[PDB]
Amino acid sequence: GSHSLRYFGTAVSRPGRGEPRFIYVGYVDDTQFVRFDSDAASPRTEPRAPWVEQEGPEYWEEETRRAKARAQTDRADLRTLRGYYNQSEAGSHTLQWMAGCDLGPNGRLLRGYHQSAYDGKDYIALNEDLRSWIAADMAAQNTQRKWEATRYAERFRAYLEGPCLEWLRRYLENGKETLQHADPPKTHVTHHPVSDHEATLRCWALGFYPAEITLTWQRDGEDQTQDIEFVETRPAGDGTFQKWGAVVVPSGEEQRYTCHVQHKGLPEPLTLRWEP
């Protein structure tokens, strides 16, 4: 259990059709709180969570300046990468990066990240010791040797160890009423006959925050792996999440089946049954 500040970036080259598209987002835990979209007239870093709107005018101008500097760097990197892979000048490519810090309950840095991908594949990542790089291929090794030359890992680590945690603590305090509130899932079980002798039990978990959750079906206390479907956790749109798991059972043996639900918002793990 740790809070996290993370920024994510996507840069997509638009060969012939002008400059690349840059879309940047920032998150505290599972809560997005800022965006930057280069495809505006005069684009700016913008609030996407209520508790960051109180930030002063200097904040928004410096974050906007920071986004524009990253865009320039990303466009350079798109060119460089096109070269390393001897790729056509025609053809759109995609660069993605993420970076940020996990706050340890100690108050210091628990884990830090700086990772990147090109055309959907891992390219280079900062190692967990924050001192070295892992490179995916020989093109990425070229980036690695150069970033070693400028001691980039040490300089970025300083951001992670200092300001990254400083801003995360700030955000956590300003948005504490939502960011530090575990919304428990509202849960229930629905019944849908499949045939004259089988029916579907669907177990629902709704409106929970944070996203992480476990949801299983059991028959006589044993965990079910056949005749099931679990959907990926999905956003409700209001900042909370949803998940369901369905199992096909013999008509008349429904009560042998229990849905098991664990979530940070649940003091105890939940056991659920169809309740006609």
Binding site: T10, V12, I23, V25, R48, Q96, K121, D122, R234, G237
Partner: protein, 100 residues
């Protein structure tokens, strides 16, 4: 370069009830590259005033987006989400099912 086909979930923000205003969600995830066209269909017709989230992506670098609009279900109207992506030969359409 890897390309990935979008997964699609269509669903409501809250348990649906006829006459009760609600939000219709089409969540597209797991796709690469990022260009993607997503429509919400009311009785086979593209709804206006559909908004979407800001492009983000998961730990495997594949993108996800939430498209959503306001709607009030009733026993007559049928809803679906229709997706176009470079990995798909023609649009993929998923109907809204009230039980999912």
């Amino acid at each position: 370069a890897i390309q990935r086909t979008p997964k699609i979930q269509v669903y409501s923000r809250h348990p649906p009830e006829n006459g009760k205003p609600n939000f219709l969600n089409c969540y597209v995830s797991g796709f690469h590259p990022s260009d993607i066209e997503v429509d919400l269909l009311k009785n086979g017709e593209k709804m206006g005033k559909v908004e979407h989230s800001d492009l983000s992506f998961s730990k495997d670098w594949s993108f996800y987006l939430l498209y959503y609009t306001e709607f009030t279900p009733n026993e007559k109207d049928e809803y679906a989400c229709r997706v176009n992506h470079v990995t798909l030969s023609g649009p993929r359409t998923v109907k809204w099912d009230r039980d999912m």
